[PDB]
Amino acid sequence: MGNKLFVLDLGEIRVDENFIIANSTFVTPQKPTVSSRLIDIPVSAYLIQCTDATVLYDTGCHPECMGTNGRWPAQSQLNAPYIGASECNLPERLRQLGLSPDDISTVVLSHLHNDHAGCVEYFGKSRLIAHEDEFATAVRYFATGDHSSPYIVKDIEAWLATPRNWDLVGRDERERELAPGVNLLNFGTGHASGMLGLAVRLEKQPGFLLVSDACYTATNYGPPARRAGVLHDTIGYDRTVSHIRQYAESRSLTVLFGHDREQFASLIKSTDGFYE
Amino acid sequence: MGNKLFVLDLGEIRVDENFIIANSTFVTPQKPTVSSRLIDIPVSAYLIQCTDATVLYDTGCHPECMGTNGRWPAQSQLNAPYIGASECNLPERLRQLGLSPDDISTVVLSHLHNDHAGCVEYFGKSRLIAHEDEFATAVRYFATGDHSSPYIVKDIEAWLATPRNWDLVGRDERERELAPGVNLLNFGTGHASGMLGLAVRLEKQPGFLLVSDACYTATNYGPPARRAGVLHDTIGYDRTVSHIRQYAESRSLTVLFGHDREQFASLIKSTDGFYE
Ligand SMILES: [Zn+2]
Ligand SMILES: [Zn+2]
Ligand SMILES: [Zn+2]
Ligand SMILES: [Zn+2]
């Protein structure tokens, strides 16, 4: 038989919509008193049971990201708090499936930001696939003690506390087959310095293209395409959205967005099913 | 024999500060309804008289940018209006100095947006220097009747209504001497698709580096550098600001920003005198 896709509900973040869809609200002399609004956006990860491997795409937040002794800086916690339930953390979502981190053959990190690489430290054996430039950038923020970005220096510290099976994607690598029907795509520079996507072909359905922050929501996707806020490389980002569209459409893959509330409702969480 | 630089006051625009310094205001859980604020930013152009040249850098807004049959689309008029006084237009500022458009040898367009290339149609003889990619972009918006950007379709129509002496800077061209002590710099892709700067050496002080929207304000310039909103190419933008800093500091030139209210107020205007 073929590939199984489990959707891991790793909670929510509460954030200004302007970060997610740039300039969705702004003041004007005509309408000078308007304010932007907070939205709650889903944090997720995807466990793929392949033929000959188990592959995890993304890892959510660190279970202890929030609080006075939390992983996230105090100001980060004020600005855009993780809001998820006690259950909504990757180690629990794995134990709920009968899995330890060690049972995962490879974990594909879309990139090394806060609510994507938060559980990297739980993986002492699994192959950790991340873009080489994403690795270089994360470790630089850590080495300089710079808390000003979505890279979490305290999380990075834990990643580096013990040797791990890092496998860094070269910036000129285009794609890698991870297993039959499972292709790792190197989106490269855009939202962050090195974005990775995962194409997963299924049996009852053609399958899914996992894109993470290469496209936050269906409203970013369009058409017309609409930029997120806080993009590292806007040109790379725009090019990557067009590539995502062409790749998925030519293959009838449904694109699964990084943080789309209404798509994430509608899915089917790992505690009560999987895709086949 | 010495170069003379005139500062031309071409009025002001009212606009949400979040466009000028990105994410200067955003909502959070504890401050869920704060509004951004409107700021008034100066629009300017620079006239350089040299022994064997008269060079203009930028051109302001079209004098008839606002109104029911104004050049600007209603959305722009409503959202970020021009609010300059009646005399604050390029033809008048030249008239005040006893000059006509045909007295200008060369007009250097920093780029081809609304409040920079608004008076290009007045120049039927002068050499019009613009980056080739910036020209290509502007025409594309006009050709598709696309009003959605800072490119003004109705101004571009007027530019194209008669042949003009366009001299387009190649993508790979680094710098051009326009006259002794006046050097055209090709900043390339960043704020828009092709940005041009102008280094102007004087006799009684080192001089000035005119950078237009490659750096809107001293706040963008820093340190620490802070990105503007609505940037075409954030990476090229970042590199351009670093290049501006290195170029100017190494030569002790004063960087004149695209829309810095405090800086502009400090400058001697063309109606009061000029720099030598
Ligand atoms: Zn991210
Ligand atoms: Zn994300
Ligand atoms: Zn501009
Ligand atoms: Zn401007």
Side-chain angles (χ1 to χ4, degrees), chain A residues 14-16 18-19 23 25-30 32-38 78-81 189 227 230-235, chain B residues 14-16 18-19 23 25-30 32-38 78-81 189 227 230-235 238:
Chain A
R14 182 153 178 81
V15 63
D16 190 325
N18 269 156
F19 289 110
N23 307 130
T25 311
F26 52 86
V27 302
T28 71
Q30 191 200 359
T33 67
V34 292
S35 71
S36 190
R37 62 189 173 110
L38 302 157
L78 274 334
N79 293 352
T189 175
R227 263 137 79 140
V230 295
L231 290 169
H232 174 243
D233 174 359
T234 50
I235 303 294
Chain B
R14 187 156 288 181
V15 63
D16 184 334
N18 270 156
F19 288 107
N23 309 115
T25 296
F26 53 92
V27 297
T28 78
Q30 65 187 167
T33 51
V34 188
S35 281
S36 192
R37 57 168 189 153
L38 295 158
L78 264 18
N79 294 1
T189 177
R227 295 224 279 248
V230 294
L231 291 167
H232 178 240
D233 178 347
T234 48
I235 297 301
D238 283 351

Short mmCIF file of all heavy atoms in Angstrom, two decimals, chain A residues 14-16 18-19 23 25-30 32-38 78-81 189 227 230-235, chain B residues 14-16 18-19 23 25-30 32-38 78-81 189 227 230-235 238:
data_model
loop_
_atom_site.label_atom_id
_atom_site.label_comp_id
_atom_site.label_asym_id
_atom_site.label_seq_id
_atom_site.Cartn_x
_atom_site.Cartn_y
_atom_site.Cartn_z
N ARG A 14 -1.79 33.84 18.86
CA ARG A 14 -2.65 35.01 18.76
C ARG A 14 -1.75 36.18 18.33
O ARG A 14 -0.80 36.53 19.04
CB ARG A 14 -3.33 35.28 20.11
CG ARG A 14 -4.29 36.46 20.09
CD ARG A 14 -5.37 36.28 21.16
NE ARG A 14 -6.31 37.41 21.23
CZ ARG A 14 -7.35 37.61 20.42
NH1 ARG A 14 -7.62 36.79 19.41
NH2 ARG A 14 -8.13 38.67 20.62
N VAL A 15 -2.06 36.78 17.18
CA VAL A 15 -1.16 37.75 16.52
C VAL A 15 -1.93 38.79 15.66
O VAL A 15 -3.00 38.48 15.09
CB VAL A 15 -0.10 36.98 15.65
CG1 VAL A 15 -0.78 36.20 14.53
CG2 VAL A 15 1.05 37.91 15.11
N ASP A 16 -1.36 39.99 15.55
CA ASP A 16 -1.87 41.04 14.65
C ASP A 16 -1.95 40.49 13.23
O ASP A 16 -0.95 39.99 12.70
CB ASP A 16 -0.93 42.26 14.67
CG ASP A 16 -1.50 43.48 13.96
OD1 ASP A 16 -2.21 43.35 12.94
OD2 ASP A 16 -1.22 44.60 14.41
N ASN A 18 -1.94 42.00 10.53
CA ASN A 18 -0.99 42.69 9.65
C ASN A 18 0.36 41.92 9.44
O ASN A 18 1.02 42.10 8.41
CB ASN A 18 -0.75 44.14 10.14
CG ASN A 18 -1.72 45.18 9.50
OD1 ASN A 18 -1.97 46.24 10.07
ND2 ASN A 18 -2.23 44.88 8.32
N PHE A 19 0.75 41.07 10.40
CA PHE A 19 1.94 40.24 10.23
C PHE A 19 1.70 39.12 9.22
O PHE A 19 2.58 38.72 8.47
CB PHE A 19 2.43 39.64 11.57
CG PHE A 19 3.03 40.65 12.49
CD1 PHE A 19 2.36 41.01 13.68
CD2 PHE A 19 4.25 41.24 12.20
CE1 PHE A 19 2.92 41.97 14.54
CE2 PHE A 19 4.81 42.20 13.05
CZ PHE A 19 4.14 42.56 14.22
N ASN A 23 -0.45 44.94 5.49
CA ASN A 23 -1.28 46.09 5.17
C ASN A 23 -2.76 45.76 4.96
O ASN A 23 -3.46 46.44 4.20
CB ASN A 23 -0.69 46.82 3.95
CG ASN A 23 0.79 47.16 4.14
OD1 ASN A 23 1.62 46.88 3.26
ND2 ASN A 23 1.12 47.74 5.28
N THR A 25 -4.93 46.18 7.36
CA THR A 25 -5.45 47.45 7.95
C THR A 25 -4.37 48.55 7.98
O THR A 25 -3.23 48.32 8.34
CB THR A 25 -6.02 47.20 9.38
OG1 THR A 25 -6.89 46.07 9.30
CG2 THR A 25 -6.85 48.39 9.93
N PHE A 26 -4.77 49.76 7.59
CA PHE A 26 -3.93 50.92 7.76
C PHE A 26 -4.86 52.11 7.91
O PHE A 26 -6.03 52.08 7.47
CB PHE A 26 -2.92 51.08 6.60
CG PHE A 26 -3.55 51.04 5.22
CD1 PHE A 26 -4.06 52.20 4.63
CD2 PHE A 26 -3.61 49.84 4.51
CE1 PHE A 26 -4.62 52.17 3.37
CE2 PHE A 26 -4.19 49.78 3.24
CZ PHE A 26 -4.70 50.96 2.66
N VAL A 27 -4.36 53.13 8.57
CA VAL A 27 -5.11 54.38 8.71
C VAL A 27 -4.98 55.27 7.47
O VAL A 27 -3.98 55.20 6.73
CB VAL A 27 -4.76 55.15 10.04
CG1 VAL A 27 -5.05 54.27 11.26
CG2 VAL A 27 -3.30 55.61 10.07
N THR A 28 -5.98 56.12 7.25
CA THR A 28 -5.95 57.08 6.17
C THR A 28 -6.63 58.34 6.70
O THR A 28 -7.34 58.27 7.72
CB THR A 28 -6.75 56.62 4.92
OG1 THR A 28 -8.15 56.66 5.23
CG2 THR A 28 -6.36 55.21 4.49
N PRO A 29 -6.41 59.49 6.03
CA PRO A 29 -7.13 60.69 6.49
C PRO A 29 -8.66 60.51 6.48
O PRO A 29 -9.35 61.05 7.33
CB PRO A 29 -6.65 61.77 5.52
CG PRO A 29 -5.24 61.31 5.16
CD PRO A 29 -5.48 59.81 4.94
N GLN A 30 -9.17 59.73 5.52
CA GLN A 30 -10.62 59.47 5.41
C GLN A 30 -11.07 58.66 6.60
O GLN A 30 -12.10 58.95 7.22
CB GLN A 30 -10.93 58.68 4.13
CG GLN A 30 -12.44 58.64 3.84
CD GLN A 30 -12.85 57.51 2.91
OE1 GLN A 30 -12.01 56.73 2.42
NE2 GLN A 30 -14.14 57.45 2.63
N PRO A 32 -9.20 57.59 9.77
CA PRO A 32 -8.00 57.69 10.63
C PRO A 32 -8.00 56.92 11.96
O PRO A 32 -6.97 56.89 12.64
CB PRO A 32 -7.97 59.18 10.96
CG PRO A 32 -9.40 59.55 11.01
CD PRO A 32 -10.03 58.80 9.88
N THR A 33 -9.14 56.34 12.34
CA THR A 33 -9.28 55.81 13.71
C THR A 33 -9.35 54.27 13.74
O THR A 33 -9.62 53.69 14.81
CB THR A 33 -10.52 56.41 14.44
OG1 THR A 33 -11.73 55.95 13.82
CG2 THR A 33 -10.49 57.94 14.44
N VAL A 34 -9.13 53.62 12.59
CA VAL A 34 -9.27 52.17 12.50
C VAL A 34 -8.10 51.50 13.18
O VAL A 34 -7.01 52.06 13.24
CB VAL A 34 -9.34 51.64 11.03
CG1 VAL A 34 -10.63 52.09 10.33
CG2 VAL A 34 -8.11 52.06 10.24
N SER A 35 -8.33 50.29 13.68
CA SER A 35 -7.24 49.53 14.28
C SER A 35 -7.17 48.19 13.58
O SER A 35 -8.18 47.72 13.00
CB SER A 35 -7.45 49.33 15.78
OG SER A 35 -8.51 48.44 16.02
N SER A 36 -5.99 47.58 13.60
CA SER A 36 -5.85 46.23 13.10
C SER A 36 -6.48 45.30 14.15
O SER A 36 -6.94 45.77 15.19
CB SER A 36 -4.39 45.86 12.85
OG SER A 36 -4.32 44.63 12.16
N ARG A 37 -6.53 44.00 13.88
CA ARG A 37 -7.09 43.06 14.85
C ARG A 37 -6.18 41.86 15.06
O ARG A 37 -5.37 41.52 14.16
CB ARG A 37 -8.47 42.58 14.41
CG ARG A 37 -8.49 41.82 13.09
CD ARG A 37 -9.91 41.58 12.61
NE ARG A 37 -9.92 40.99 11.27
CZ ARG A 37 -10.29 39.74 11.00
NH1 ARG A 37 -10.68 38.92 11.98
NH2 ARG A 37 -10.25 39.30 9.75
N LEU A 38 -6.31 41.26 16.24
CA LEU A 38 -5.70 39.98 16.57
C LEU A 38 -6.50 38.83 15.98
O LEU A 38 -7.75 38.81 16.05
CB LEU A 38 -5.57 39.79 18.08
CG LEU A 38 -4.78 40.79 18.93
CD1 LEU A 38 -5.25 40.74 20.40
CD2 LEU A 38 -3.27 40.58 18.81
N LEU A 78 4.45 38.62 25.10
CA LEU A 78 3.47 39.71 25.08
C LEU A 78 2.93 39.95 23.67
O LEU A 78 1.71 40.04 23.46
CB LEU A 78 4.05 41.01 25.65
CG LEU A 78 4.06 41.38 27.15
CD1 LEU A 78 2.94 40.71 27.96
CD2 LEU A 78 5.42 41.13 27.77
N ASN A 79 3.83 40.03 22.69
CA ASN A 79 3.45 40.40 21.33
C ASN A 79 2.58 39.38 20.59
O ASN A 79 1.61 39.77 19.94
CB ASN A 79 4.69 40.76 20.50
CG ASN A 79 5.38 42.04 20.98
OD1 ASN A 79 4.87 42.77 21.85
ND2 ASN A 79 6.55 42.31 20.43
N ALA A 80 2.92 38.10 20.68
CA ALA A 80 2.24 37.05 19.92
C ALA A 80 2.32 35.75 20.70
O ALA A 80 3.16 34.89 20.43
CB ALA A 80 2.84 36.89 18.50
N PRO A 81 1.43 35.61 21.71
CA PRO A 81 1.56 34.46 22.59
C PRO A 81 1.10 33.15 21.95
O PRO A 81 0.17 33.12 21.13
CB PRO A 81 0.67 34.84 23.77
CG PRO A 81 -0.37 35.69 23.17
CD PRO A 81 0.31 36.47 22.09
N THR A 189 15.43 30.81 -0.30
CA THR A 189 15.25 32.07 0.39
C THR A 189 13.86 32.72 0.13
O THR A 189 13.36 32.73 -1.00
CB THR A 189 16.46 33.02 0.08
OG1 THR A 189 16.23 34.31 0.66
CG2 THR A 189 16.67 33.19 -1.44
N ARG A 227 1.25 39.41 -0.15
CA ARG A 227 2.40 39.25 0.74
C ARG A 227 2.05 39.20 2.24
O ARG A 227 1.21 39.96 2.72
CB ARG A 227 3.45 40.33 0.45
CG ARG A 227 4.56 39.83 -0.47
CD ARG A 227 4.98 40.81 -1.56
NE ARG A 227 5.86 41.87 -1.09
CZ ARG A 227 6.91 42.34 -1.76
NH1 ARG A 227 7.26 41.85 -2.95
NH2 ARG A 227 7.63 43.31 -1.23
N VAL A 230 6.63 40.81 7.62
CA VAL A 230 7.90 40.33 8.18
C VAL A 230 8.58 39.23 7.35
O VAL A 230 8.93 38.16 7.87
CB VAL A 230 7.80 40.03 9.72
CG1 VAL A 230 7.51 41.34 10.50
CG2 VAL A 230 6.70 38.96 10.05
N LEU A 231 8.74 39.49 6.06
CA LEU A 231 9.40 38.57 5.13
C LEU A 231 10.89 38.87 5.07
O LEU A 231 11.27 40.03 4.99
CB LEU A 231 8.81 38.69 3.73
CG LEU A 231 7.38 38.18 3.58
CD1 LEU A 231 6.81 38.59 2.23
CD2 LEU A 231 7.22 36.66 3.84
N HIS A 232 11.73 37.84 5.11
CA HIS A 232 13.16 38.09 5.00
C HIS A 232 13.48 38.63 3.58
O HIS A 232 14.13 39.67 3.40
CB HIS A 232 13.94 36.79 5.26
CG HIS A 232 15.41 36.91 5.03
ND1 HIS A 232 16.07 36.18 4.06
CD2 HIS A 232 16.35 37.67 5.63
CE1 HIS A 232 17.37 36.48 4.09
NE2 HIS A 232 17.55 37.39 5.03
N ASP A 233 12.97 37.92 2.57
CA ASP A 233 13.34 38.14 1.16
C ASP A 233 12.03 38.13 0.37
O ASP A 233 11.49 37.07 0.04
CB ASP A 233 14.29 37.00 0.75
CG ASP A 233 14.66 37.01 -0.74
OD1 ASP A 233 14.21 37.86 -1.52
OD2 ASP A 233 15.42 36.11 -1.12
N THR A 234 11.53 39.31 0.06
CA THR A 234 10.26 39.44 -0.63
C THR A 234 10.26 38.84 -2.05
O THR A 234 9.30 38.18 -2.43
CB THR A 234 9.78 40.90 -0.63
OG1 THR A 234 10.85 41.76 -1.08
CG2 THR A 234 9.41 41.31 0.82
N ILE A 235 11.33 39.07 -2.82
CA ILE A 235 11.42 38.50 -4.18
C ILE A 235 11.43 36.99 -4.13
O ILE A 235 10.67 36.33 -4.86
CB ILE A 235 12.68 39.02 -4.94
CG1 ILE A 235 12.67 40.58 -5.02
CG2 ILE A 235 12.81 38.38 -6.33
CD1 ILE A 235 11.54 41.21 -5.88
N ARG B 14 0.43 62.94 3.35
CA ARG B 14 -0.06 62.45 4.62
C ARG B 14 -0.26 60.95 4.44
O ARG B 14 -0.89 60.51 3.48
CB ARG B 14 -1.40 63.13 4.98
CG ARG B 14 -1.93 62.81 6.38
CD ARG B 14 -2.89 63.92 6.87
NE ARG B 14 -2.12 65.14 7.18
CZ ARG B 14 -2.64 66.27 7.64
NH1 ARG B 14 -3.96 66.38 7.85
NH2 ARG B 14 -1.85 67.31 7.88
N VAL B 15 0.29 60.16 5.35
CA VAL B 15 0.26 58.72 5.20
C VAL B 15 0.48 58.01 6.53
O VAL B 15 1.13 58.54 7.45
CB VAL B 15 1.40 58.30 4.19
CG1 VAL B 15 2.78 58.67 4.78
CG2 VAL B 15 1.32 56.79 3.82
N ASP B 16 -0.05 56.80 6.61
CA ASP B 16 0.12 55.96 7.77
C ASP B 16 1.62 55.68 7.96
O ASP B 16 2.31 55.20 7.06
CB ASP B 16 -0.68 54.66 7.56
CG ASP B 16 -0.64 53.73 8.77
OD1 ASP B 16 0.31 53.79 9.56
OD2 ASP B 16 -1.58 52.94 8.94
N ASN B 18 3.14 53.38 9.32
CA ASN B 18 3.51 51.97 9.11
C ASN B 18 4.03 51.70 7.70
O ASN B 18 4.68 50.69 7.46
CB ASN B 18 2.32 51.02 9.43
CG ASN B 18 2.29 50.56 10.90
OD1 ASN B 18 1.22 50.19 11.44
ND2 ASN B 18 3.43 50.58 11.54
N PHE B 19 3.76 52.61 6.76
CA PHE B 19 4.31 52.45 5.40
C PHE B 19 5.76 52.92 5.33
O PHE B 19 6.54 52.44 4.54
CB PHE B 19 3.48 53.23 4.38
CG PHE B 19 2.14 52.61 4.11
CD1 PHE B 19 0.99 53.20 4.59
CD2 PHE B 19 2.03 51.45 3.34
CE1 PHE B 19 -0.27 52.64 4.33
CE2 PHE B 19 0.78 50.86 3.09
CZ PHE B 19 -0.37 51.48 3.58
N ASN B 23 5.92 48.14 10.67
CA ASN B 23 5.47 47.68 12.00
C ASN B 23 5.81 48.63 13.15
O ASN B 23 6.15 48.18 14.25
CB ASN B 23 5.99 46.26 12.28
CG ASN B 23 5.68 45.32 11.14
OD1 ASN B 23 6.57 44.82 10.47
ND2 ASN B 23 4.40 45.15 10.86
N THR B 25 3.70 50.40 14.57
CA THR B 25 2.57 50.15 15.48
C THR B 25 1.95 48.83 15.05
O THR B 25 1.75 48.58 13.85
CB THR B 25 1.48 51.26 15.39
OG1 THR B 25 2.01 52.52 15.82
CG2 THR B 25 0.23 50.93 16.25
N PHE B 26 1.61 47.99 16.03
CA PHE B 26 0.84 46.78 15.78
C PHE B 26 0.04 46.42 17.04
O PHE B 26 0.43 46.83 18.14
CB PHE B 26 1.74 45.62 15.33
CG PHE B 26 2.88 45.34 16.25
CD1 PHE B 26 2.75 44.41 17.28
CD2 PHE B 26 4.10 46.01 16.10
CE1 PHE B 26 3.81 44.14 18.16
CE2 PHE B 26 5.18 45.74 16.95
CZ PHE B 26 5.02 44.79 17.99
N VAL B 27 -1.07 45.71 16.87
CA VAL B 27 -1.89 45.31 18.02
C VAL B 27 -1.34 44.05 18.68
O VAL B 27 -0.72 43.20 18.02
CB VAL B 27 -3.40 45.13 17.67
CG1 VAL B 27 -4.02 46.46 17.22
CG2 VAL B 27 -3.63 44.04 16.64
N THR B 28 -1.55 43.95 20.00
CA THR B 28 -1.16 42.79 20.80
C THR B 28 -2.28 42.47 21.82
O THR B 28 -3.16 43.31 22.04
CB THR B 28 0.17 43.01 21.59
OG1 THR B 28 -0.07 43.82 22.75
CG2 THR B 28 1.23 43.66 20.71
N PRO B 29 -2.25 41.27 22.43
CA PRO B 29 -3.22 40.93 23.49
C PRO B 29 -3.49 42.02 24.56
O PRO B 29 -4.67 42.24 24.92
CB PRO B 29 -2.62 39.67 24.12
CG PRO B 29 -1.95 39.00 22.96
CD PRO B 29 -1.36 40.12 22.14
N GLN B 30 -2.43 42.68 25.05
CA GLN B 30 -2.63 43.71 26.06
C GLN B 30 -3.01 45.06 25.45
O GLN B 30 -3.61 45.89 26.12
CB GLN B 30 -1.44 43.83 27.03
CG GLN B 30 -0.12 44.29 26.43
CD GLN B 30 1.03 44.22 27.42
OE1 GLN B 30 2.20 44.31 27.05
NE2 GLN B 30 0.70 44.03 28.70
N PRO B 32 -5.02 45.59 22.29
CA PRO B 32 -5.67 44.99 21.14
C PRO B 32 -6.30 45.95 20.14
O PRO B 32 -6.71 45.51 19.06
CB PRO B 32 -6.75 44.09 21.78
CG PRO B 32 -7.04 44.70 23.10
CD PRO B 32 -5.84 45.50 23.52
N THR B 33 -6.38 47.23 20.48
CA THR B 33 -7.08 48.19 19.62
C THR B 33 -6.34 49.51 19.31
O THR B 33 -6.96 50.45 18.82
CB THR B 33 -8.52 48.51 20.14
OG1 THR B 33 -8.46 48.89 21.52
CG2 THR B 33 -9.45 47.30 19.97
N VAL B 34 -5.04 49.56 19.56
CA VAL B 34 -4.24 50.74 19.20
C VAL B 34 -4.30 51.01 17.69
O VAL B 34 -4.25 50.08 16.87
CB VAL B 34 -2.76 50.65 19.68
CG1 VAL B 34 -2.06 51.99 19.45
CG2 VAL B 34 -2.70 50.30 21.16
N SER B 35 -4.44 52.28 17.33
CA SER B 35 -4.43 52.72 15.95
C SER B 35 -3.01 53.21 15.62
O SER B 35 -2.31 53.75 16.49
CB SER B 35 -5.47 53.84 15.74
OG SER B 35 -6.80 53.34 15.62
N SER B 36 -2.58 52.99 14.38
CA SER B 36 -1.36 53.62 13.89
C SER B 36 -1.63 55.13 13.75
O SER B 36 -2.76 55.57 13.96
CB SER B 36 -0.93 53.02 12.55
OG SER B 36 0.38 53.45 12.22
N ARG B 37 -0.61 55.92 13.41
CA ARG B 37 -0.83 57.35 13.20
C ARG B 37 -0.41 57.82 11.82
O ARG B 37 0.46 57.22 11.16
CB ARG B 37 -0.14 58.18 14.26
CG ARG B 37 1.33 57.94 14.36
CD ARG B 37 1.98 59.01 15.23
NE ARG B 37 3.43 58.92 15.15
CZ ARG B 37 4.27 59.93 15.32
NH1 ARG B 37 3.83 61.16 15.58
NH2 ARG B 37 5.58 59.71 15.23
N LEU B 38 -1.03 58.93 11.42
CA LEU B 38 -0.71 59.60 10.19
C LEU B 38 0.44 60.57 10.43
O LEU B 38 0.49 61.24 11.46
CB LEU B 38 -1.94 60.34 9.65
CG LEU B 38 -3.12 59.43 9.23
CD1 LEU B 38 -4.40 60.26 9.25
CD2 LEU B 38 -2.90 58.72 7.86
N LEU B 78 -7.53 59.32 -1.53
CA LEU B 78 -8.17 59.08 -0.24
C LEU B 78 -7.18 58.57 0.82
O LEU B 78 -7.25 59.00 1.98
CB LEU B 78 -9.28 58.03 -0.41
CG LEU B 78 -10.74 58.43 -0.61
CD1 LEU B 78 -10.91 59.83 -1.03
CD2 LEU B 78 -11.57 57.47 -1.51
N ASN B 79 -6.30 57.64 0.43
CA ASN B 79 -5.49 56.89 1.42
C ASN B 79 -4.19 57.56 1.85
O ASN B 79 -3.73 57.40 2.98
CB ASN B 79 -5.14 55.50 0.86
CG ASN B 79 -6.38 54.60 0.68
OD1 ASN B 79 -7.54 55.01 0.94
ND2 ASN B 79 -6.15 53.37 0.22
N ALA B 80 -3.57 58.27 0.91
CA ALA B 80 -2.30 58.97 1.19
C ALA B 80 -2.20 60.23 0.33
O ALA B 80 -1.46 60.29 -0.66
CB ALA B 80 -1.07 58.01 1.01
N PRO B 81 -3.01 61.26 0.67
CA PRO B 81 -3.12 62.44 -0.17
C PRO B 81 -1.86 63.30 -0.21
O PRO B 81 -1.12 63.40 0.78
CB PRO B 81 -4.25 63.25 0.53
CG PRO B 81 -4.17 62.85 1.97
CD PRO B 81 -3.87 61.35 1.87
N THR B 189 17.98 47.11 -7.68
CA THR B 189 16.72 46.66 -7.09
C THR B 189 16.66 46.85 -5.55
O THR B 189 17.60 46.55 -4.84
CB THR B 189 16.44 45.18 -7.49
OG1 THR B 189 15.23 44.72 -6.84
CG2 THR B 189 17.62 44.24 -7.10
N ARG B 227 13.62 48.65 8.32
CA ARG B 227 12.99 48.58 7.01
C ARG B 227 11.75 49.48 6.90
O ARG B 227 10.98 49.60 7.85
CB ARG B 227 12.65 47.13 6.64
CG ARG B 227 13.90 46.25 6.49
CD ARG B 227 13.83 45.36 5.27
NE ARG B 227 13.04 44.16 5.51
CZ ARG B 227 13.53 42.92 5.55
NH1 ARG B 227 14.82 42.68 5.36
NH2 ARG B 227 12.70 41.92 5.78
N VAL B 230 6.18 48.30 2.40
CA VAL B 230 5.95 48.23 0.96
C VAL B 230 7.22 48.31 0.13
O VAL B 230 7.33 49.12 -0.77
CB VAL B 230 4.81 49.26 0.52
CG1 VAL B 230 3.45 48.82 1.12
CG2 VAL B 230 5.17 50.77 0.86
N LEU B 231 8.19 47.43 0.42
CA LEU B 231 9.43 47.34 -0.34
C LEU B 231 9.28 46.26 -1.41
O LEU B 231 8.80 45.15 -1.13
CB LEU B 231 10.59 46.98 0.59
CG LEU B 231 11.01 48.05 1.58
CD1 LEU B 231 11.96 47.45 2.62
CD2 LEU B 231 11.66 49.25 0.86
N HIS B 232 9.69 46.57 -2.63
CA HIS B 232 9.70 45.57 -3.70
C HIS B 232 10.63 44.38 -3.37
O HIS B 232 10.23 43.22 -3.40
CB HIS B 232 10.14 46.23 -5.02
CG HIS B 232 10.21 45.27 -6.15
ND1 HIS B 232 11.37 45.01 -6.86
CD2 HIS B 232 9.26 44.46 -6.68
CE1 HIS B 232 11.12 44.11 -7.80
NE2 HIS B 232 9.85 43.77 -7.71
N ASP B 233 11.86 44.68 -3.00
CA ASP B 233 12.92 43.69 -2.83
C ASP B 233 13.64 44.04 -1.53
O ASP B 233 14.49 44.93 -1.50
CB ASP B 233 13.89 43.83 -4.02
CG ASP B 233 15.08 42.88 -3.96
OD1 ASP B 233 15.36 42.26 -2.91
OD2 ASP B 233 15.78 42.81 -5.00
N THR B 234 13.29 43.34 -0.46
CA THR B 234 13.84 43.66 0.87
C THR B 234 15.34 43.41 0.96
O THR B 234 16.08 44.20 1.60
CB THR B 234 13.10 42.87 1.98
OG1 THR B 234 12.99 41.48 1.59
CG2 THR B 234 11.69 43.44 2.13
N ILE B 235 15.80 42.33 0.34
CA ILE B 235 17.23 42.03 0.34
C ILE B 235 18.08 43.11 -0.37
O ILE B 235 19.09 43.61 0.19
CB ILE B 235 17.54 40.61 -0.24
CG1 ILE B 235 16.90 39.51 0.65
CG2 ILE B 235 19.06 40.42 -0.35
CD1 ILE B 235 17.36 39.50 2.10
N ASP B 238 18.03 46.27 1.83
CA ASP B 238 18.97 46.17 2.95
C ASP B 238 20.40 46.44 2.48
O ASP B 238 21.10 47.22 3.08
CB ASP B 238 18.94 44.77 3.54
CG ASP B 238 17.71 44.51 4.43
OD1 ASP B 238 16.95 45.46 4.74
OD2 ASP B 238 17.53 43.34 4.83
#
